[PDB]
Design a protein around this ligand. Structure first.
Ligand SMILES: [Mg+2]
Ligand SMILES: [Zn+2]
Ligand SMILES: [Zn+2]
Lengths: 205, 1375, 62, 46, 106, 248
């Protein structure tokens, strides 16, 4: 049921990340037909900083996943267009993350494009509205200035904090880049609730 | 001239030739050990390498044996030798550089993107044999490690086999440039040439005294060194004589065995529990210590220990003679070693020597500055220790009472002090040492006094109280009626109860000799010193005993008002040990733990002095049933056996049908286990036989002094069914017999452990054996108590011990945050009180009636009530969510808080001179603002009063820490509750709230990671099975053994129908393709296939759409489907077929109309290009294996699924929080969180898994942190530790962003640079070897790093530095 | 108890010879084959001052 | 050979030492087994 | 080729930075550890000298030190090391036990 | 340690004179006073039946057989007491020996067979003083009473004393009482130095003119530990804490 969940929660993800859509939303059966034929579905969004974010949803059997050459071709032909790109989210099935090859093309395209964020994620990260899960505390991104004043009061360096991966599901839904700080409000059975600040490190892939 | 220093860091490196030649103080030249009495000069025993003999000094430092640490020596090897520890390093250096030029063969700009301590190993991993150089064009040969030893390598140039002698290896490594080392992982200090040694280090004699067996290996090595030619030269491939080859391999083997033999080795001294680190560095043998058997003494206070006088004259206390104690110390000096108390030695500072007191001068005097070593006297403090030391109350400081009777050799202590040490008087031994230093003596009395351990750090509740005689004696004393009538005593006997308490005696002047005093009147005389308020029911009142026994109404409700015992008995509930909220816990909370210990002793003497006039005994007739009551028990037991026989007769006729899931065997045994349980009415004949007013066996049980109801039933009525592993006696005597006495497949209940006899009646041989089997199990599990938790304790401590409280109340590991605030509230576990929040459950109408103030019409009282609602709703929302992501953790209105504000208010309402105050709006308006401002400034408790005056901004995490206390203050100090309190009395209440809140904060520099490890490892004793070992090892999902899940239903309306829950619970379960198939065959065709060719006929005519397609080669995978299971779970044939050709489009099924025959295609075989043994047999089974695992219906990983009934809270339309009991959900067997979200019958926002790894993978590290707390909490049980000790495990294990373990792998990830901590844990030799090749810098912090370096941790009393106040001394003192 | 009947003819390490021994008033079959090593002490089952609490006994000095 | 020192604390200990037989598995073999009655004392152990 | 002591450079000396009194963040109440340490140090130093401004006479260093702490006459200061900057500073807070809250030391 | 045949072992805690022990109306007084609270959880009923049976044996003049698995009847054994002139429960009116006051309760007293367990307190009793035999290598006391050495504060005792914050006790026991010593280290190289105040030696074998020796408190087994690591070609360098200076 992964694709039906994706077709709703990818747009809930785009809305939660404060992005407007650059296309028209197609009926669900049209979505499935494009994924099955073209091999992927492309969603464009515009951030507040007028940057373009493109999301690629890949089928669990397409040519772009099993063969590195087609994925490389798609990445070169997507990163050569006339848009002000800010990030590429590539949504794949979970086993694709254990396949070394496609990960190597991802790392070369990161190296070949230093100002573009190339991220590859599994399906489960977008099959539910992650911020609304009960078990997940409330995450928020704080500015560099607020974090700097917090650390100056605390006599701390950013490396002294607890750290959170940039591929942590709530940090992905926030858009947390490495080097940012995420304030987390969590339930406590001793103080009834607590606040911590974590330092976003590099992603798993 | 040498100033005071402290080691800040330790750097690890590899020692080369230059280091040995510069550190060494001499060179070993001869093999002569002793020329004469003195050691031979130039040998391995030379006096330049230190002195281990008491005749001669060290030549080097001119110190005696005690002050000389030894010095190293040099041995110039005639032949270079490989370093034994870094042999692997040598190997992995021979693989990545060219043997002819030294320039690297691999590409330097390929491995540079990885972290430095890895890229060298990665480069050595890739194959290099056959590769050719670029600057010298020399093909790099193979490097093959020999298997006849540990060090020799062979160069293999396409079959040319040569032996790489260490001279050749040094020549190869000498041409490696420094840039090659730097830019391919290693440091400038780890140049490979240092791996081959020509000058070895002979260790100092202080390391090898006993001029040992190491001295033989050093002596043998020096002798065979001399045989080797002085200038032997080795070139590549050169011929050498075999005698030299033997000598070269002999010195290398001797050196390798000198270091790493069987890891007489230098490195074999380190590893094990008896090794250097754990036995000599992490432990100690100490002087000035004693040990003896412990014994009881009811005349000792709880913080006193009785010390035998013979021990008091052995152990001493050092007293520096000054002008203020010269007169006090003179009697000790004059008594000497012949009269007690005396002394043993005097340290004269004008000669700097210690003189024994008996062989001492006649012209001797005590000068100011001498140190007198006097005896131990009454009032001295002493550390008291019982092993194993598992909690921090295992060492406590007691005031010494010297037992001057010479015939007593035991350590005597009060029975109520045994709760600290988990001790009893069956032969336990305890250690005792008396601090002799002034600094150690101060902190014994101020820090380590046993009053500090009165409240448990593990459980936050009291430890001490009455045990066994003051529990049953306090019951008898406060009992309303004696068998002699009213429970009273005359004035003389009331006075006699107090003549031992060692308090100030009360006044009995207003009592005639014939005036009678109640037992409660006498207790009230003692409790008036520390007036408390108490009201609970006693242990005496049990609803179990109520039907068969008459209770006196003024005994079953204990009440205390300002220290007056108004009614009720005192027993285990009030005065018992470990009783939370009892008399002594309340006394400690108002007057301090020392005042509570003084009252335990004082009420103990009233209890004991009462019984010495009332008597208490147990006899054989206390355990004997009346003949009428014996028949009543036999009737009850026959009913148990008759109901057990009814089940057997159903088994005879085959009338036992189990449910869906259980077999007939397990359903039969469940029926038997429950049919053979004693009814609650079994206590009618027991309670009919006994008189509760006189029976001593009943009164020990009923008051909670000792024993339990099953003990009374076993003794008096019957033992019943023996359950082992909640199961009956399983037949282990040859296939259906439990014992030789019972026939095979016996159906009687006696054959499986039902004991119809009580102990008082006497068991028979089969019943004795079954009871023996039951008893032996408990002994074995108690034997696993020590071993299982002991190993888990040491791994918990080494993972947690580096966590120490900062000056911000944060928890850090030297700089790195583990917790932003300790416990998220910043409080000590010994300073908490459980208090009820009384707005949580109220409705919007009840809350408005109770808490809305309508007396004055001002907007301030609308706002005051609105914050009450907001705190109410916020509390509801937070802990209603906590209920969602837990299995069975429900909302509570009772919290642990630093301060009990309700009791503080009422204790000031009673001691007031004013009654009901007149109405006064200004006073009410003034009081509201003072409470409002107090709550606003409350988080400044966490900073200081300087920042509160300046009103500097408060950090957000400190605002959140004061949220519970802000909520509580606004409840208990609401206007509707402080009407009678004056404004002057309000400022008194606020000051006392803020004082008690400051006193409850955790101390700077407290080792709270050790506290957590101690507190969580204690409840594992009553549990160390697989599940704890899965939480603490961070085991992945596939490694779990007890994975579960808790799926809620899609709708709060549909949760009520149990039938609807069963519909969904069957859908999600994994019904794969294997279990549907009863028979299957992998393959004019085979016989019995005429139906198949008939199936070929009728299937083709059904629909001509599809036929055996153009691709079908040679295989016939025919199966048949069990039809019972298809009906059982309502599977359909349409479902099965459509499932099979929607995941595997490599087949055509021919479903027929049950049989199924799967055929395949040739296209399925040729995309196996990654496989070059791909036959037809294996790949056909492989695709069957990939087809048989196809999910027919359900969620993968969900093996089972049951419907369970949940207890949950919810807010009504009236705002009331009700606990709904009629809620159904699914508890699967196996976790798949993502599978449950791809499903519309399950609510996706409340999926609860018991898997930490599955929660981390799906939800993140913050949800995995909460999961670790929940998963540890279940393992702890019902008496698990405080919640802040669980946050300590979870915050440490998740501090890096990933869930790390408490094993060596986790310590390596969290603290990689702390080499000394990691060596102390498991395996020093491998840890030290890695640290040397990495040039590891190890900053000194924590516990283990300073302990291994011989220093003390900067912790506790040493966390803050003391400096001398110059500006105060120059203006107040004179030279 | 009577650990051996030849103790004066031995040089033992940490061995105890008890002078007086009694047959139990309630004996069992095991005392047909082993010498009893004990005394028939008069025991009172009672609370007396709190000195026999938790597996301790009060003994008669006489 | 597995031998022990004859610690003659009393005559009962002397007789008991001469009739003493010496040897999850570590906990499975410390049980009281159903074949013991008559040959191994069900009560006597450490 | 060289020795480890060659490239070894000793830790550079530090400057003691003292936080001004109005910017101190730690508590104005002695911890039990700090009070215990002050009394222990003062008791040992009274075992050395014996010179004290305490008005009443005692026969033990420990009693003198305890009363000096309680009566606010103890001639010591508490240094709380907040941070060590890698530029070479040691930021500390100086706390005067004569002017702080004294914990419950029964 | 004493014990009855039912396995109820106990330590002799107090010894009272004849005139302080309790006595019945007939002058019978105990040899042992055992707590009634040792019975109910341990369920040692054979000791109570033995006292009941043995109480009438003594007056009858007989020794009876109380072997296990013989038929017994505690009701008939208690009636045997009443036929011998005692109470059914075997309890008697008893007086307090110290005050002469009768208890308001009959006390269960009678002959129970007791044994002396060979755990002598004098054998387990031990105490050392500040000095004695010392191990040659580590410099710590020897192991226990047999060697006239010291007792052990093991690994778990340092965990407890660290949890308590008792660091000045750890110095006193693990340093001033076990094997503490003074180590000298050169500032400029981190290697051990050679310092001798009397017979003045102030030298480092690695600098020899840039020697800056500071004394660090250590303990001998740790210095032995660092020499054992250097003997295996792992170089240990100790970075000392830097000097701190007030500004200006
Ligand atoms: Mg014991
Ligand atoms: Zn020397
Ligand atoms: Zn030096």
């Amino acid at each position: 049921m992964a694709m039906q969940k994706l077709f709703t929660y990818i747009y809930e993800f785009i809305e939660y990340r404060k992005m407007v859509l650059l296309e028209e939303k197609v009926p669900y059966d049209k979505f499935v037909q494009m994924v099955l034929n073209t091999g992927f579905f492309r969603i464009n969004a515009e951030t507040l900083n007028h940057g373009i974010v493109s999301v690629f949803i890949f089928g669990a059997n397409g040519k772009y996943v099993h063969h590195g050459g087609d994925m490389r071709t798609l990445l070169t032909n997507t990163l050569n267009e006339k848009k002000h790109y800010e990030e590429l989210i590539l949504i794949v099935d979970k086993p694709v993350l254990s396949k070394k090859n496609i990960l190597d093309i991802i790392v070369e395209q990161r190296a070949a494009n230093p100002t573009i964020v190339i991220n590859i994620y599994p399906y489960h990260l977008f099959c539910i509205n992650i911020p609304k899960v009960s078990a997940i505390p409330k995450h928020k991104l704080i500015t560099q200035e607020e974090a700097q004043e917090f650390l100056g009061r605390e006599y701390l360096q950013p490396q002294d904090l607890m750290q959170i991966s940039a591929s942590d599901p709530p940090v992905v839904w926030l858009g947390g880049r490495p080097g940012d700080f995420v304030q987390i409000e969590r339930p406590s059975e001793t103080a009834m609730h607590a606040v911590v600040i974590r330092f976003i490190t590099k992603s798993k892939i | 001239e040498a100033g005071y220093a402290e080691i800040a860091a330790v750097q690890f490196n590899i020692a080369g030739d230059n280091d040995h030649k510069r550190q060494g103080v001499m060179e070993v030249t001869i093999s002569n050990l002793f020329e004469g009495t003195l050691p031979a000069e130039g040998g391995i025993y030379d006096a330049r390498m230190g002195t281990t003999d008491h005749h001669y000094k060290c030549i080097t430092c001119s110190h005696q044996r005690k002050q000389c640490m030894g010095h190293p020596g040099i041995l110039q090897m005639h032949a270079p030798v490989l370093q034994p520890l870094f042999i692997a390093e040598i190997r992995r250096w021979l693989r990545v550089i060219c043997l002819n030029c030294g320039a690297p063969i691999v590409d330097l700009k390929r491995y540079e993107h990885l972290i430095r301590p890895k890229r060298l190993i990665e480069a050595a991993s890739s194959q290099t044999e056959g590769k050719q150089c670029y600057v010298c064009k020399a093909v790099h040969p193979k490097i093959v490690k020999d298997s006849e030893d540990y060090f020799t390598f062979w160069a293999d140039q396409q079959g040319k086999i040569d032996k790489l002698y260490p001279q050749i290896i040094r020549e190869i490594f000498s041409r490696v440039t420094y840039d090659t080392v730097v830019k391919l992982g290693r440091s400038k200090n780890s140049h490979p040439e240092k791996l081959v040694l020509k000058a070895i280090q002979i260790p100092p004699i202080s390391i090898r005294p006993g001029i040992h067996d190491i001295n033989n290996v050093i002596q043998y090595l020096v002798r065979k060194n001399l045989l080797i030619p002085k200038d032997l030269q080795i070139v590549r491939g050169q011929k050498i004589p075999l005698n030299i080859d033997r000598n070269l391999q002999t010195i290398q083997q001797l050196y390798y065995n000198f270091l790493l033999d069987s890891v007489p080795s230098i490195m074999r001294r380190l590893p094990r529990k008896e090794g250097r680190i754990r036995k000599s560095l992490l432990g100690s043998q100490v002087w000035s210590i004693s040990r003896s058997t412990i014994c009881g003494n009811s005349d000792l206070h709880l913080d006193e220990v009785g010390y035998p006088i013979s021990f008091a004259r052995t152990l001493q206390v050092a007293e520096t003679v000054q002008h203020y104690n010269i007169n006090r110390l003179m009697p000790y000096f004059l008594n000497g070693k012949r009269q007690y108390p005396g002394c043993s030695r005097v340290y004269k500072q004008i000669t700097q020597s210690v003189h024994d007191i008996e062989g001492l001068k006649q012209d001797f005097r005590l000068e100011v500055g001498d140190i007198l070593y006097r005896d131990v006297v009454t009032g001295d403090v002493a550390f008291f220790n019982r092993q194993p030391s598992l909690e921090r109350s295992s060492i406590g400081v007691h005031r010494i009472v010297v037992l001057e009777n010479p015939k007593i050799s035991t350590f005597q202590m009060n029975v109520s002090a045994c709760a600290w040490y988990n001790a009893d008087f069956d032969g336990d031994q305890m250690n005792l040492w008396v601090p002799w230093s002034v600094m150690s003596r101060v902190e014994a009395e101020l820090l380590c006094s046993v009053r500090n351990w009165f409240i448990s750090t593990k459980s936050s509740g009291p430890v001490n109280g009455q045990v066994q005689d003051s529990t049953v004696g306090s019951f008898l004393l406060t009992r309303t009626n004696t068998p002699m009538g009213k429970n009273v005593m005359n004035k003389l006997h009331a006075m006699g109860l107090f003549q031992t308490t060692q308090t100030d005696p009360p006044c009995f002047a207003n009592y005639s000799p014939t005036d009678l005093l109640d037992g409660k009147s006498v207790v009230s005389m003692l409790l008036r010193q520390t007036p408390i308020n108490y009201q609970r029911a006693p242990t005496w009142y049990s609803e179990v005993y109520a039907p068969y026994m008459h209770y006196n109404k003024q005994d079953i409700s204990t009440q205390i008002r300002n220290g007056e015992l108004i009614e009720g008995v005192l027993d285990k509930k009030a005065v018992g040990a470990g009783s939370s909220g009892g008399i002594y816990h309340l006394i400690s909370r108002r007057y301090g733990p020392q005042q509570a210990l003084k009252m335990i002793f004082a009420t103990q003497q009233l209890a004991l002095n009462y019984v010495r006039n009332a008597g208490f005994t147990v006899s054989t007739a206390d355990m004997l049933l009346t003949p009428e009551a014996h028949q009543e028990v036999q009737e009850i037991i026959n009913e148990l056996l008759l109901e057990s026989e009814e089940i057997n007769n159903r088994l005879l006729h085959g009338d036992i049908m189990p449910p869906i899931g259980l077999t007939t065997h397990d359903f039969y045994e469940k029926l038997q286990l429950n049919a053979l349980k004693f009814p609650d009415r079994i206590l009618k004949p027991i309670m009919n036989s006994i008189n509760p007013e006189t029976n001593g066996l009943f009164q020990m049980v009923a008051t909670g002094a000792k024993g339990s109801n099953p003990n009374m039933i076993h003794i008096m009525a019957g033992i019943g069914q023996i359950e082992i592993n909640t199961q009956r006696i399983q037949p282990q005597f040859s296939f259906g017999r439990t014992l030789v006495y019972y026939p095979r497949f016996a159906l009687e209940a006696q054959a499986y452990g039902f004991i119809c006899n009580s102990y008082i009646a006497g068991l028979t041989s089969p019943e004795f054996i079954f009871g023996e089997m039951n008893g032996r199990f408990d002994l074995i599990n108690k034997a696993l108590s020590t071993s299982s938790t002991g190993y888990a304790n040491r791994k918990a401590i080494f993972g947690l011990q580096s966590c120490i409280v900062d000056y911000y109340r944060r928890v850090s590991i030297d700089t790195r945050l583990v917790q932003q605030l300790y416990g998220e509230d910043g409080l000590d576990a010994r300073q908490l009180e459980t208090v009820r929040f009384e707005t949580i459950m109220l409705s919007d109408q009840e809350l408005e009636d109770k808490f809305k103030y309508t007396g004055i019409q001002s907007p301030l009282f609308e706002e005051e009530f609105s914050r009450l609602k907001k705190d109410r709703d916020k509390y509801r929302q937070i802990f209603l969510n906590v209920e969602n992501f837990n299995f069975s953790q429900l909302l509570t209105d009772v919290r642990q808080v630093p301060v009990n504000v309700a009791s503080i208010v009422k204790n000031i309402l009673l001691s007031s001179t004013s009654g009901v105050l007149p109405f006064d709006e200004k006073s009410i308006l003034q009081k509201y603002a003072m409470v409002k401002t107090f709550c606003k400034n409350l988080p400044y408790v966490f900073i200081n009063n300087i920042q509160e005056r300046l009103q500097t901004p408060i950090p957000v995490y400190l605002k959140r820490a004061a949220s519970l206390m802000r909520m509580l203050i606004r409840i208990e100090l609401a206007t509707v509750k402080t009407l009678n309190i004056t404004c002057e009395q309000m400022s008194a209440i606020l000051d006392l709230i803020r004082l008690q809140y400051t006193q409850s904060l955790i101390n700077y520099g407290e080792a709270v990671g050790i506290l957590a490890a101690q507190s969580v490892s204690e409840p594992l004793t009553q549990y160390g099975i697989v599940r704890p070992q899965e939480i603490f090892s961070a085991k992945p999902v596939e490694a779990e053994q007890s994975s579960e899940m808790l799926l809620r239903l899609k709708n709060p309306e549909v949760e009520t129908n149990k039938t609807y829950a069963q519909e969904i619970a069957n859908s999600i379960e994994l019904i794969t393709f294997e279990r549907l198939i009863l028979q299957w065959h992998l393959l004019v065709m085979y016989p019995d296939f005429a139906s198949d060719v008939e199936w070929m006929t009728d299937f083709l005519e059904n629909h001509p759409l599809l036929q055996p397609p153009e691709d079908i080669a040679n295989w016939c995978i025919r199966l048949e489907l069990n039809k019972t299971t298809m009906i059982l779970k309502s599977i359909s044939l349409e479902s099965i077929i459509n499932s099979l050709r929607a995941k595997h489009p490599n087949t055509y099924i021919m479903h027929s109309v049950i049989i199924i025959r799967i055929y395949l295609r040739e296209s399925a075989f040729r995309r196996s290009t990654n496989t070059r043994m791909a036959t037809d047999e294996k790949i056909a089974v492989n695709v069957v294996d990939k087809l048989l695992n196809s999910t027919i219906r359900g969620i993968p990983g969900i093996k089972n699924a049951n419907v369970v009934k949940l207890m949950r809270h919810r807010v009504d339309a009236q705002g009331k929080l009700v606990r709904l009991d009629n809620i159904y959900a699914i508890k699967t067997n196996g976790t798949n969180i993502f599978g449950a979200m791809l499903d519309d019958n399950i609510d996706p926002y409340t999926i609860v898994s018991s898997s930490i790894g599955d929660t981390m993978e799906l939800y993140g590290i913050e949800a995995a942190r909460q999961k670790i707390i929940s998963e540890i909490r279940t393992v702890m049980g019902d008496k698990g530790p405080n919640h802040r000790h669980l946050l300590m495990y979870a915050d440490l294990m998740t501090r890096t962003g990933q869930v790390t373990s408490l094993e060596k792998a986790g310590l390596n990830a969290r603290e990689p640079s702390n080499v000394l901590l990691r060596m102390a844990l498991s395996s020093p030799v491998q840890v030290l070897t890695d640290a040397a090749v990495d040039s590891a810098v190890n900053p000194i912090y924590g516990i283990a790093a300073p302990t291994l370096m011989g220093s003390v941790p900067r912790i506790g009393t040493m966390y803050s530095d003391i400096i001398m106040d110059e500006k105060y001394i120059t203006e107040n003192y004179k030279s | 108890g009577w650990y051996c009947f030849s103790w004066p003819y031995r040089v033992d390490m940490n061995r105890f010879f008890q002078f007086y021994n009694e047959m139990p008033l309630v004996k069992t079959i095991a005392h047909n084959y082993v010498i009893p090593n004990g005394l028939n002490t008069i025991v009172a089952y009672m609370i007396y001052g709190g000195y026999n609490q938790e597996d301790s006994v009060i003994v008669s000095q006489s | 050979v597995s031998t022990q020192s004859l610690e003659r604390k009393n005559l009962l200990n002397t007789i008991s030492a001469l009739r003493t037989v010496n040897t999850e598995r570590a906990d499975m073999m410390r049980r009281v087994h159903a074949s013991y009655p008559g040959y191994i004392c069900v009560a006597q152990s450490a | 080729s060289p020795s480890i002591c060659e490239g070894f450079v000793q830790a550079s000396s530090q400057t003691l930075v003292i936080i001004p009194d109005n910017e101190r963040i730690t508590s104005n109440v002695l911890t039990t550890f700090e009070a215990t340490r002050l009394v222990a140090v003062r008791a040992q130093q009274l075992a050395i000298n014996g010179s004290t401004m305490l008005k009443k006479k005692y026969s033990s260093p420990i009693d003198i030190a305890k009363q000096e702490l309680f009566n606010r006459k103890i001639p010591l200061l508490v240094m709380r090391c907040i941070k060590v900057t890698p530029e070479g500073q040691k930021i500390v807070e100086i706390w005067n036990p004569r002017e702080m809250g004294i914990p419950l030391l029964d | 340690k004493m014990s009855s045949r039912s396995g109820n072992k106990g330590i002799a805690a107090l010894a009272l004179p004849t005139s302080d022990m309790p006595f019945t109306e007939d002058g019978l007084q105990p040899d042992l006073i055992v707590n009634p609270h040792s019975h109910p959880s341990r369920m040692t009923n054979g000791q109570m039946i033995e006292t009941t049976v043995g109480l009438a044996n003594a007056l009858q003049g007989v020794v009876t057989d109380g072997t296990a698995f013989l038929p017994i009847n505690v009701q008939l054994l208690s009636e045997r007491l009443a036929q011998e002139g005692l109470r059914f429960n075997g309890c008697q009116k008893m007086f307090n020996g110290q005050t002469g006051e009768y208890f308001d309760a009959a006390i269960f007293i009678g002959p129970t067979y007791h044994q002396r367990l060979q755990k002598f307190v004098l054998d387990d009793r031990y105490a050392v003083a500040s000095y004695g035999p010392t191990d040659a290598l580590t410099g710590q006391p020897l192991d226990g009473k047999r060697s006239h050495g010291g007792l052990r504060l093991g690994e778990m005792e340092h965990w407890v004393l660290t949890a308590q914050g008792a660091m000045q006790t750890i110095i006193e026991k693990s340093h001033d009482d076990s094997d503490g010593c003074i180590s000298y280290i050169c500032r400029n190289c981190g290697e051990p130095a050679i310092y001798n105040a009397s017979h003045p030696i102030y030298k480092c074998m690695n600098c020899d003119v840039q020697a800056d020796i500071g004394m660090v408190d250590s303990r001998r087994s740790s210095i032995v530990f660092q020499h054992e690591m250097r003997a295996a070609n792992v170089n240990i360098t100790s970075v000392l804490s830097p000097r701190v200076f007030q500004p200006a």
